[PDB]
Amino acid sequence: CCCGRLIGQHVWSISKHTQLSPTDAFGTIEFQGGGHSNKAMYVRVSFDTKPDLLLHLMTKEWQLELPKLLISVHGGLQNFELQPKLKQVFGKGLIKAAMTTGAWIFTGGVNTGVIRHVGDALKDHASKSRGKICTIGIAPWGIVENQEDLIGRDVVRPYQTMSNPMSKLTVLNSMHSHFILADNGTTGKYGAEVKLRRQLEKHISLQKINTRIGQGVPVVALIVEGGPNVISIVLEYLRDTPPVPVVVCDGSGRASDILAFGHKYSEEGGLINESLRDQLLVTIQKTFTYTRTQAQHLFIILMECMKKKELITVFRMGHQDIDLAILTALLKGAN
Amino acid sequence: QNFELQPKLKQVFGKGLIKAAMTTGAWIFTGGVNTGVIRHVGDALKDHASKS
Amino acid sequence: ASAPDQLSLALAWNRVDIARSQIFIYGQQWPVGSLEQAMLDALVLDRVDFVKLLIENGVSMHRFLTISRLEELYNTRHGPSNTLYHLVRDVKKREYLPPDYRISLIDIGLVIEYLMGGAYRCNYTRKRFRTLYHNLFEINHFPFPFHELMVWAVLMKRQKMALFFWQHGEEAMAKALVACKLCKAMAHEASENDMVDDISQELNHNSRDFGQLAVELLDQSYKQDEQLAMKLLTYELKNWSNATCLQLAVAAKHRDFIAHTCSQMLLTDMWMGRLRMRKNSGLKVILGILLPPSILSLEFKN
Amino acid sequence: QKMALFFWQHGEEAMAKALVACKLCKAMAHEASENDMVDDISQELNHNSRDFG
Amino acid sequence: KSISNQVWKFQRYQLIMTFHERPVLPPPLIIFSHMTMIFQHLCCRWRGLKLFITDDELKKVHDFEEQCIEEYFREKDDRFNSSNDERIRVTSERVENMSMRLEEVNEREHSMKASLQTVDIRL
Amino acid sequence: GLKLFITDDELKKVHDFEEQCIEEYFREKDDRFNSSNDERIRVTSERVENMSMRLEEVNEREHSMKASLQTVDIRL
């Protein structure tokens, strides 16, 4: 159907005609499979809910104290590969920043792409001694595999790591400590989690943590690769209010490399020469393959992003972990 | 006036002039004020003449 | 073939990384029962890598472990052989053997009594257990199963097996000390029947190894926090015959354990009792017992 | 201790400072043994004094 | 004298425990202290190093065991991955793989040098 | 007589001597660490691991370059 499900498997309103029902599946996941057993508590939340109820849930109903950092893990949605030492230095820096600031890690949640690198990062930080880090994931409900297994009020449901290689549904990462499942009523379609995640990250930054040394709760976003939508979400944070700094982790290609090649040669934002900008559009339209009709628009987004260069911190491998860049952006975007 | 150099050329020539002063025991007349060529040779002795 | 059967082929080949990639697969239907059955074969063939992976996919050791499943794990001659046979002969005769005699949970319990020595009066000889055993010859599922697997791999000499069940379990310091006492005394019985010196040295290496895994366990606990470390040392262990880490360690004769700083401070704070003076001791305690007026000038803890 | 070494390097009269720190640390060592606290404390102050020495 | 002190610390446990678990008056007077103990369990009957601990307290002690088992095996790993035998181990395999892989590169680069003169003539 | 009160200038000489001994001592120590067997093995190890990454990168690049040069020969 339009919702992607089977024609007989039924039972926004535009073309899906949804009706707003009370929530029914919430509780705890017993992760059998994948090495160590980890309990991860999950709540289904509609995509159009108020963020203050999720904040009240995460503070009182979830026994999670307010962190001093919000490391987001916005990245490539499809599965990719990295250098082994680059993934190792990335994971070590991420877990080191996570212990030093006590952060909540807003990883996507479904086990494909940069989320799989975050779960491998938690394999390095065994975290069998300090897993308090709320590795809270924001993945849509209709896309997770074995949706019938996670039905149940306050029930510790078994969830195997069974991930069929031809199935469109994606199993969740077994090493996350918490889960939020964004239900818009459809199955197998992206975009149901994005705006809820934006308003909860803004609502966490809305809270003034008791220190508020710079201000508020300081949120820092991390990007590894991504589509043109990663250039777009970079345009989101890099010109946001209060402008949220982002480490654009390099050595990986796709969006972050084009952003880095802009940022190394941008000077005062629009002060880039034509010469390398031509080879830029060649790689933007040929290496990343994004058609030139929109790669002119990728010029204007990239240069509008360099209009605030400063917050976009690069990182390179080659010791010298990413936690340098995370704490540096933490001190930039604080006022 | 103040300038800057490539790091490989600054390190090779900077190590060279200090290890002339190691062996010859020379006197090194400079401008004395830390700007430009005097600022470069101040970092040049702070490069390996501070470890020898 | 069906993947349970193909798993038992992998168990033989001992090619565990091919077994965790192809035998274990998405959607691969394991008929209920065969997964636990393959676990049992993995224990008795000493496939410690294979029990690591079969708990990694999950065998839920609490649910697997049963009185009769563990009993077959005590009578299996398959795998690396042992000294238990001889050790049961000592115990049967002292209380009062045919080779077909299939050993018992209560029967090894009285053995544990003989070598650990003194008290260590285990759950297998508690009267409550002898009535469940009488009635049967999650009630029959052992409460903290990993303890029962430790005592087994200690008695049937299985070292890389045993060290696995140590890390994955609970009552961690206790398990090390009990393993030390059980190995050392079996090493004594090795030389008491003065058999092959190979078993006597091997159990005595093992008594030392499971030995040190106590002392740096305490050592880095002291680095964590001094208080909770002492709380561990004096913690009353119902599963280990209602005793403490100090009592097991002195019964095992592990001086280093009663000589590392944390235990000594505990001992010194017991010689104080419920008073706090120290300093010029020896003389001040003598002056107190001779002058009951003079104790009124000595400090007391709150 | 590490703060004391940084103070030891940066400064003057360091021979005097070194030997005085040695005496003060050994003295704190036998006094803390005379209170028979953690012998790690007595041993720590004693290793301290041996180092400054 | 090689061992000494350790044997002494062992003999302390036997000492401290036994003198604790005795009645209060000295040998000629223990008679009175027995009759004090007897009268204590004839009025409470007819009519030290064991902290009975609470559940929430064994919950944090078992958790303290479970955060003290893992950090150790981390040290065991790092010690091995920094010990000067395994550091020389992992050099020699990596240099071995650097032998073959640079072997590939120099031999293949010779085809590319041929391609330079090939493109010079054919273009 | 083993307490030769010094004139303040000569005392300053004594201080500056002692400062030189401080500096050379710590410098020697740095030489004793940067030329002990242990640290040399450490630095060689880390640097060879870096070299092995970067040689793998050169090999992949070489593959791309060789294919590109073959394509240039195809267009020639």
Side-chain angles (χ1 to χ4, degrees), chain A residues 1-4 8 10 13 15 18 20-22 25-29 31-35 37-38 40-47 49 51-53 55-57 59 61-62 66-72 74-77 79-80 82 84 86 89-91 93-95 97-104 106-115 117-119 121-122 124 126-127 129 131 133-147 149 151-154 156-158 160-163 165 167 169-194 196-207 211 214 216-229 231-235 237-238 240 242-257 259-260 262-265 269-270 273 275 277-278 281-284 289-291 293 295 297-301 305-306 308-311 313-318 320-331 333-334, chain B residues 2-3 5 7 9-10 12 14 16-38 40-42 44 47-52, chain C residues 1-4 7-8 10-16 19 21-24 27-28 30-31 33-55 57-58 60-62 64-71 73-75 78-84 86-92 97-106 108-115 117-126 128-133 140-159 161-172 174-180 182-185 187-191 193-194 199-230 232-254 256-273 275 280-290 292-298 300, chain D residues 1 3-33 35-36 41-53, chain E residues 1-13 16-20 22-30 32-38 40-44 48-58 60-85 87-93 95-99 102 105-106 108 114, chain F residues 1-5 7 10-11 13-38 40-52 55 58-59 61 67:
Chain A
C1 56
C2 183
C3 294
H10 319 122
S13 179
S15 164
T18 189
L20 183 63
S21 66
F26 75 105
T28 300
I29 282 163
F31 276 117
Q32 303 93 8
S37 55
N38 189 359
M41 180 177 70
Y42 70 98
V43 164
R44 294 179 66 187
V45 182
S46 174
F47 86 112
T49 53
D52 74 314
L53 271 189
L55 188 146
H56 182 62
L57 177 88
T59 53
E61 318 267 2
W62 276 31
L66 183 63
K68 280 73 176 175
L69 195 48
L70 211 54
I71 194 54
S72 315
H74 292 73
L77 279 181
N79 189 359
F80 42 83
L82 262 178
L86 188 47
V89 65
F90 182 76
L94 191 83
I95 64 166
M99 320 315 265
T100 49
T101 70
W104 291 359
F106 264 122
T107 298
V110 288
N111 196 261
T112 300
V114 74
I115 297 89
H117 292 77
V118 168
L122 294 174
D124 181 65
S127 212
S129 32
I133 294 169
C134 301
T135 303
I136 293 182
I138 316 295
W141 182 258
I143 311 181
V144 298
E145 184 177 1
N146 314 324
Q147 283 173 102
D149 284 5
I151 301 299
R153 283 171 190 308
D154 302 285
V156 176
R157 310 285 311 119
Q160 210 53 45
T161 69
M162 182 303 277
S163 52
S167 78
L169 302 178
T170 301
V171 68
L172 291 175
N173 205 317
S174 284
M175 292 176 68
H176 292 351
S177 80
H178 291 100
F179 270 109
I180 300 298
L181 277 296
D183 181 28
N184 63 349
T186 63
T187 61
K189 299 144 75 180
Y190 288 169
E193 96 277 357
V194 176
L196 187 77
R197 165 187 270 211
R198 298 294 297 165
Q199 66 196 277
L200 276 295
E201 292 178 352
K202 293 179 179 179
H203 208 277
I204 287 304
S205 77
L206 183 63
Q207 303 328 294
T211 186
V217 167
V219 176
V220 65
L222 196 168
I223 310 296
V224 161
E225 295 181 356
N229 65 7
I231 299 91
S232 89
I233 193 66
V234 159
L235 182 63
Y237 276 140
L238 276 295
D240 191 359
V244 160
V246 174
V247 64
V248 297
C249 181
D250 292 330
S252 52
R254 284 290 284 279
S256 66
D257 181 65
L259 277 165
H263 191 271
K264 186 150 34 70
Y265 313 127
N273 63 6
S275 178
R277 182 177 292 172
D278 305 346
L281 191 141
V282 175
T283 52
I284 295 169
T289 62
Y290 305 144
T291 61
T293 71
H297 180 253
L298 293 174
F299 289 178
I300 190 167
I301 310 157
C305 284
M306 307 301 131
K308 325 293 281 303
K309 288 174 70 175
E310 45 265 42
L311 295 174
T313 59
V314 305
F315 153 81
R316 205 151 312 111
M317 184 279 289
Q320 294 83 18
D321 292 331
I322 62 169
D323 62 359
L324 314 182
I326 307 194
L327 295 198
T328 291
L330 176 45
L331 294 174
Chain B
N2 200 2
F3 48 86
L5 295 176
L9 280 79
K10 156 70 169 286
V12 165
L17 61 84
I18 61 190
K19 72 184 304 293
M22 296 299 102
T23 55
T24 72
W27 282 344
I28 297 90
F29 307 135
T30 61
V33 298
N34 191 87
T35 292
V37 64
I38 304 101
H40 271 248
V41 298
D47 187 19
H48 310 115
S50 59
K51 54 173 281 313
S52 290
Chain C
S2 83
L7 182 62
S8 82
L11 253 300
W13 301 331
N14 190 359
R15 180 68 180 88
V16 64
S21 49
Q22 175 257 353
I23 300 298
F24 289 132
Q28 184 34 269
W30 296 93
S34 61
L35 188 147
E36 292 83 3
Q37 164 64 39
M39 179 53 101
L40 187 144
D41 291 331
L43 277 297
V44 299
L45 277 297
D46 187 74
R47 296 291 184 268
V48 65
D49 291 331
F50 266 108
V51 301
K52 185 183 287 185
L53 276 296
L54 192 43
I55 193 66
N57 301 255
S60 163
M61 187 66 204
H62 285 75
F64 167 59
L65 200 44
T66 315
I67 61 170
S68 55
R69 293 181 185 270
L70 179 58
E71 182 66 27
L73 173 55
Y74 292 158
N75 290 317
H78 295 89
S81 85
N82 63 7
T83 65
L84 260 195
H86 276 49
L87 276 296
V88 176
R89 300 292 178 90
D90 291 331
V91 176
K92 298 296 289 184
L97 183 63
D100 63 358
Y101 169 62
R102 215 210 181 260
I103 302 299
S104 164
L105 282 153
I106 62 170
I108 63 169
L110 267 106
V111 176
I112 301 299
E113 296 294 328
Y114 167 45
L115 79 159
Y120 191 21
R121 180 66 183 271
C122 68
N123 189 359
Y124 310 146
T125 48
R126 296 282 72 76
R128 156 86 286 177
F129 190 68
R130 334 171 61 81
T131 77
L132 281 72
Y133 182 76
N140 63 7
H141 295 284
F142 289 108
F144 301 161
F146 274 131
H147 305 341
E148 291 82 3
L149 277 296
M150 152 118 358
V151 304
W152 155 75
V154 184
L155 294 174
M156 297 188 168
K157 66 180 179 66
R158 292 179 185 270
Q159 293 298 111
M161 173 72 52
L163 277 296
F164 167 77
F165 293 106
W166 181 53
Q167 184 178 2
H168 307 77
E170 65 268 65
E171 313 196 289
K175 293 208 304 184
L177 301 168
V178 177
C180 180
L182 276 295
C183 294
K184 198 86 52 195
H188 201 49
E189 183 65 26
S191 179
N193 301 355
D194 61 358
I199 63 171
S200 66
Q201 50 98 44
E202 162 206 340
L203 276 295
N204 195 242
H205 294 284
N206 292 322
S207 87
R208 291 190 294 270
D209 306 333
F210 264 119
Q212 293 85 19
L213 277 297
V215 65
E216 68 272 15
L217 180 47
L218 167 76
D219 196 327
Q220 185 62 256
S221 296
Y222 183 76
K223 300 290 94 176
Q224 295 297 109
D225 61 357
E226 293 83 4
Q227 185 68 36
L228 264 168
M230 294 183 286
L232 175 52
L233 296 189
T234 300
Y235 180 75
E236 188 276 331
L237 306 126
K238 276 74 68 178
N239 297 115
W240 306 108
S241 180
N242 291 51
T244 62
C245 313
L246 277 296
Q247 292 203 10
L248 276 296
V250 299
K253 282 260 343 134
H254 200 237
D256 48 329
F257 197 66
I258 324 108
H260 163 287
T261 305
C262 194
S263 67
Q264 282 299 292
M265 292 325 121
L266 183 90
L267 283 163
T268 300
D269 301 354
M270 186 64 202
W271 183 64
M272 296 297 103
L275 98 98
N280 180 62
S281 68
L283 315 184
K284 283 181 164 58
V285 55
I286 284 167
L287 264 63
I289 75 174
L290 295 174
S294 74
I295 78 162
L296 306 178
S297 78
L298 281 293
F300 273 67
Chain D
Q1 181 64 37
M3 186 64 73
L5 281 293
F6 161 71
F7 292 158
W8 179 56
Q9 174 170 348
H10 297 55
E12 68 274 15
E13 308 209 314
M15 202 74 102
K17 318 209 280 179
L19 301 151
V20 166
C22 186
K23 181 69 176 177
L24 294 174
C25 274
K26 182 175 73 175
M28 268 178 282
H30 65 277
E31 180 271 353
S33 189
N35 289 318
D36 203 318
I41 301 299
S42 178
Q43 183 66 220
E44 190 277 333
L45 290 157
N46 189 359
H47 194 68
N48 282 33
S49 66
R50 291 189 296 271
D51 291 331
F52 293 107
Chain E
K1 297 292 184 182
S2 296
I3 190 166
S4 294
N5 57 101
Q6 184 178 3
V7 298
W8 171 58
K9 292 179 179 179
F10 204 101
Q11 295 298 110
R12 314 200 43 261
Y13 179 70
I16 301 299
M17 183 278 288
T18 64
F19 293 104
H20 155 81
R22 298 292 184 270
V24 63
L25 277 296
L29 277 296
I30 307 189
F32 292 161
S33 295
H34 291 91
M35 295 299 102
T36 300
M37 295 296 172
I38 301 299
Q40 184 178 2
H41 64 98
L42 294 175
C43 173
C44 297
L49 278 299
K50 265 178 209 213
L51 77 168
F52 304 137
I53 194 67
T54 88
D55 31 35
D56 60 287
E57 291 177 352
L58 62 84
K60 66 178 72 66
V61 160
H62 278 105
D63 187 74
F64 171 45
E65 293 178 353
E66 294 293 328
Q67 303 162 325
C68 82
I69 192 63
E70 191 276 331
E71 82 278 11
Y72 170 41
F73 271 86
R74 164 182 321 200
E75 298 143 11
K76 143 165 358 197
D77 291 331
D78 112 273
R79 292 182 183 174
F80 184 39
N81 296 115
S82 180
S83 66
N84 296 115
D85 281 25
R87 290 231 238 77
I88 70 128
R89 205 174 41 60
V90 298
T91 57
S92 67
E93 292 84 5
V95 176
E96 271 295 83
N97 301 2
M98 186 180 289
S99 178
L102 191 155
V105 175
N106 189 359
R108 185 182 295 276
Chain F
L2 290 198
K3 191 170 310 174
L4 177 63
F5 332 103
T7 62
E10 171 83 355
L11 162 77
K13 280 73 176 175
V14 176
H15 296 106
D16 286 32
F17 184 37
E18 184 178 3
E19 292 222 2
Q20 293 180 357
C21 309
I22 292 194
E23 294 294 328
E24 295 330 282
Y25 160 61
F26 277 125
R27 181 177 65 83
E28 165 52 51
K29 186 180 289 293
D30 303 359
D31 290 331
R32 195 152 61 280
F33 199 46
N34 301 355
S35 170
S36 48
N37 292 320
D38 293 332
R40 294 181 182 179
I41 301 299
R42 175 281 301 299
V43 65
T44 299
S45 179
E46 195 256 359
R47 289 180 70 248
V48 176
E49 299 306 86
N50 293 6
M51 296 296 172
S52 67
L55 198 55
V58 176
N59 189 359
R61 185 182 295 276

